[PDB]
Symmetry: C3
Subunit: 321 residues, 3 copies
Amino acid sequence: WIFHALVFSYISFALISDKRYQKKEPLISSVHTKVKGIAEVKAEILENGMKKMVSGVFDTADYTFPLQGNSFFVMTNFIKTEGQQQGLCPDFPTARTICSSDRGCKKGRMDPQSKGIQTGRCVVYKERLKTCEVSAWCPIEEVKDAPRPALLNSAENFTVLIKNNIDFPGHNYTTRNILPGVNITCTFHKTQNPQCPIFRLGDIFQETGDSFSDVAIQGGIMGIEIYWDCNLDGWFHHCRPKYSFRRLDDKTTSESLYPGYNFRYAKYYKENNVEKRTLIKVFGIRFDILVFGTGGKFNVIQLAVYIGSVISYFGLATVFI
Amino acid sequence: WIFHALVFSYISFALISDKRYQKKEPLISSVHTKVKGIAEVKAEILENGMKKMVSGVFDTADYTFPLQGNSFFVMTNFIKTEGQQQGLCPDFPTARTICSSDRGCKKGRMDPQSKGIQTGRCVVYKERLKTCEVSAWCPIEEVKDAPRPALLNSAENFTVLIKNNIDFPGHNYTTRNILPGVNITCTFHKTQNPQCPIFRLGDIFQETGDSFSDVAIQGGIMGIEIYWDCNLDGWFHHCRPKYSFRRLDDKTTSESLYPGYNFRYAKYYKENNVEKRTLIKVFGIRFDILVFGTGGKFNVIQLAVYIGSVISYFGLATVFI
Amino acid sequence: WIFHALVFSYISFALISDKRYQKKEPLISSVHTKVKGIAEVKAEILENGMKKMVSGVFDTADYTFPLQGNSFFVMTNFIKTEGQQQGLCPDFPTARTICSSDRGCKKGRMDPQSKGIQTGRCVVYKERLKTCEVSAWCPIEEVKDAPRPALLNSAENFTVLIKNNIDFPGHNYTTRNILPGVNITCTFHKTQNPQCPIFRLGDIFQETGDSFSDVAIQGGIMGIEIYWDCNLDGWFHHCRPKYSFRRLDDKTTSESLYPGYNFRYAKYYKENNVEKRTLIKVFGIRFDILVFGTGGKFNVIQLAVYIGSVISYFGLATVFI
Ligand SMILES: O=C(C[C@]12C[C@H]3C[C@H](C[C@H](C3)C1)C2)Nc1cccc2nc(NCCNCCO)ccc12
Ligand SMILES: O=C(C[C@]12C[C@H]3C[C@H](C[C@H](C3)C1)C2)Nc1cccc2nc(NCCNCCO)ccc12
Ligand SMILES: O=C(C[C@]12C[C@H]3C[C@H](C[C@H](C3)C1)C2)Nc1cccc2nc(NCCNCCO)ccc12
Ligand SMILES: *[C@@H]1O[C@H](CO)[C@@H](O[C@@H]2O[C@H](CO)[C@@H](O)[C@H](O)[C@H]2NC(C)=O)[C@H](O)[C@H]1NC(C)=O
Ligand SMILES: *[C@@H]1O[C@H](CO)[C@@H](O[C@@H]2O[C@H](CO)[C@@H](O)[C@H](O)[C@H]2NC(C)=O)[C@H](O)[C@H]1NC(C)=O
Ligand SMILES: *[C@@H]1O[C@H](CO)[C@@H](O[C@@H]2O[C@H](CO)[C@@H](O)[C@H](O)[C@H]2NC(C)=O)[C@H](O)[C@H]1NC(C)=O
Ligand SMILES: *[C@@H]1O[C@H](CO)[C@@H](O)[C@H](O)[C@H]1NC(C)=O
Ligand SMILES: *[C@@H]1O[C@H](CO)[C@@H](O)[C@H](O)[C@H]1NC(C)=O
Ligand SMILES: *[C@@H]1O[C@H](CO)[C@@H](O)[C@H](O)[C@H]1NC(C)=O
Ligand SMILES: *[C@@H]1O[C@H](CO)[C@@H](O)[C@H](O)[C@H]1NC(C)=O
Ligand SMILES: *[C@@H]1O[C@H](CO)[C@@H](O)[C@H](O)[C@H]1NC(C)=O
Ligand SMILES: *[C@@H]1O[C@H](CO)[C@@H](O)[C@H](O)[C@H]1NC(C)=O
């Protein structure tokens, strides 16, 4: 009957369109990115109630490190606390660190917010305000918001160049993201330059619809996705990437969940024969490059299995009517 | 017959239970962990036969660096050799470095255990013991065991917070390890808090049944596994992680296989207009976060293929009896 | 007929050979590599038209850092620019930086090749040659080729030891690259020692057919592949790795595509109460360890599905003749 040529046709259609005849191999990627662009910074930051002038120019080595583990990071803001040395000092005044008397402090106590071990003594921090005394690197860094203008706010104007090599082992097929002979001088655009590997970070943040400056103040984790729908047949060959952009960070905005991206970097030195340390809280956006792909190539055994599940249907449609 | 409704029922059962109707997509994860906790260290370490007092407090910046490549490391013990400068010095006495005369040493020789190039001269190291003379950073670090108490033995009391975002692209489904609104203040427990992302390192080492201190002396590689069995149907929806713990390091305990986790960190400075270097052998536990998942969502073509292989069986069971 | 026992036999053959009866699970790997070997460097490098003598010995800490993200790097060449401080200086003379008059320079201009922000002034750089004045770390590094002999040319003689642990979760099977009791003292050979994990970098570069020195001058990205075809049956059990070597870098050799592997490392210090910086351009080869595997174990449901697509064929071959 007609419903049978229609069943055959629906099966074969699902084969040809859903690519059931092809064998699919997982993709293998290695990433090499180079960042370009510099930022000039003139800003006034308050340290310990005293105005200080942070000025200067930041180049590649000043704000970034080469990617490792398919992810690179760019510092967009920072807080610097200098001159720390091992000693005893009162903790920074917080809801949990203020003491009325020595009875309020407990010797040897450790608190998740604090950075030192208490000595069980109540001492003044400033004027008549009293905090608990601790043993740590002194003085203790301020509990302060990241500067209201992100010191490296120019970070949206930076340029990231992404090189991606992909290899399918089952089919012995190697290709790279940048095809030979292309005009390298371009800026990636969703339509105008969908294969251009030159990305602007601000463009990236507009794609996902999040403001760059806001994330740049306190940090975040952004992700770049590279898709490969690759066909290794010849009768319909195609194998290029599709760039998409997703914001990965949670954006909880709760003190308990350590929001944004930041980490503590330590630089050690010696003055007057004393072990000393400058502590730098680093704020920035970490970019994670995720590359995924599927390689299809005509396989005879798969066609055999597919018509295998197809023929039983083909006659069952006869038993049905 | 009855065996036929039983064959139909066994096939359909394997479908409903082994989830044959669903399409399975691979999981995509990015990891962001924050470490919390500090350690106070008072210990006596022998350098060159002289007792020295290692004291002080170690905070986040002092023992760890932000994770990259889905793995973070925590230093648990260390050996420090200070004041090195380019020069000529006798190698540290070993089974392979002791020399009776200049004939025993070979100029320009390189040995896997040694850290310098020999000059072919036999010279005294201490008293009448003689070793081969080498060209390297001097003095050469001691061949010494890591301190019998791990200097940062408090490391089991530390807290690691793990944030995991997972995304299935074929189904356009994004979720994160921490569901919104949960009580963040908890410590992970195999039963009491199986979804709590706050982990204690000592608890981790008890799960895999290995003592934390022993690994902390000379280092090791520990691994955290995060499973996602995710169902994107609705008729039986569920998609949460299962935390499991495996000890990854080999634990060979053979000098040839460089057991444990350690690496050589170099800090450079200048004194009296001389290039100089302090070398620090770092011992610690590296934690590797491995995240895997499968996303199932009802697929009509798969049901078609499955009943496709099912019907042939269904009649063959008739031909059999 | 005979063509039918032949169809049955072809189907069952494809089953037994293409391993259709087995269930395949993806492999999970963590990598731990230790690098061994040192290099002695005596070379004459020209800085600012003045000959300078770079001598000294480089050990593990001097040229490498422990791997993170399944990739380790080894510096093979370097360029060092010392004494930089924040200030105003003329840019290094280039095709884009030479100025005839102040009209040629534009204040506040930024150029991808330059490392500073222009001040719109034309000033002399050397003799009567004039470049545009910029605001940056001064002096600006030379536009110079990497030293004609790679300073760390000895890098091909280095030894990398690779430890790989693989685990299949669906089958609960854990194994490691190094089986217990093997003779560790060996050098990997394609035939003589195909399971030896001790690799020589020069051997690696000969496998892929690229000269080590050439890549060592300006850097590159090399990749080590570890295959696991693992059978968890018993009736034909086998599960060991196959080491293969592929050169991953593009080798474009175009200034626009930033060829080779290099990055900018910054070291900060203070002299006469002035913020200062030494900038080091690092050239080296990054090795990316890619591990892939498939674990097969006899599965009854898969045999059921396979004969499911098989029987329909088995009778259709009867309808055909
Ligand atoms: O610490 C770094 C290097 C990196 C940055 C990220 C994070 C971490 C790994 C990697 C990526 C390298 C450290 N950069 C800096 C941080 C904070 C302040 C800095 N100030 C500078 N000079 C300005 C002086 N003004 C006087 C002028 O009159 C220069 C560099 C700075
Ligand atoms: O080197 C580091 C930083 C890290 C540690 C790991 C490994 C590596 C990358 C990243 C993670 C940062 C280096 N920390 C240290 C190592 C060894 C000794 C140290 N001693 C310290 N002061 C004690 C002085 N006592 C005098 C008191 O009277 C402070 C820090 C120390
Ligand atoms: O900077 C590093 C450390 C690493 C190297 C790579 C890249 C980066 C991360 C990690 C891997 C550590 C930095 N090493 C060096 C670089 C350049 C020059 C050096 N010169 C040295 N002394 C020679 C003096 N001659 C006077 C004798 O009369 C010693 C070390 C040097
Ligand atoms: C990134 O660069 C753009 C242009 O290069 C900056 O936009 C310019 O802003 C200045 C004032 O600061 C204006 O005089 C220009 O006319 C603007 N140009 C354009 C094309 O709009 C932008 O400010 C830079 N980003 C940051 C954070 O400074
Ligand atoms: C980790 O912390 C626990 C408790 O916070 C420590 O156990 C305590 O040990 C001290 C003596 O050192 C005792 O006075 C306490 O009563 C103990 N408390 C508990 C709850 O057992 C433990 O010693 C710490 N780990 C390390 C390595 O110091
Ligand atoms: C790597 O090591 C080999 C041997 O260890 C070096 O080859 C030697 O070169 C010297 C001269 O430089 C000769 O005297 C030896 O006879 C050579 N030995 C062999 C076995 O050929 C090689 O030069 C080293 N690589 C580099 C870059 O120096
Ligand atoms: C992959 O294909 C190329 C085609 O030129 C061939 O030269 C190469 O040997 C193949 N590799 C393998 C492992 O078969
Ligand atoms: C690349 O395209 C731009 C226009 O977008 C053009 O100005 C430039 O000359 C092109 N490059 C080459 C090498 O043709
Ligand atoms: C994914 O689903 C959400 C549901 O609200 C939708 O808004 C979004 O556009 C979808 N994404 C794609 C790529 O279809
Ligand atoms: C979380 O649970 C603890 C008890 O385990 C409780 O004391 C605490 O108040 C809870 N947090 C919130 C916000 O309810
Ligand atoms: C894996 O197999 C071993 C075999 O001895 C067994 O001890 C272990 O409990 C198994 N693990 C799981 C999760 O079943
Ligand atoms: C390993 O093999 C070498 C020969 O290639 C031999 O000299 C050495 O003794 C062997 N090691 C052991 C422990 O037998």
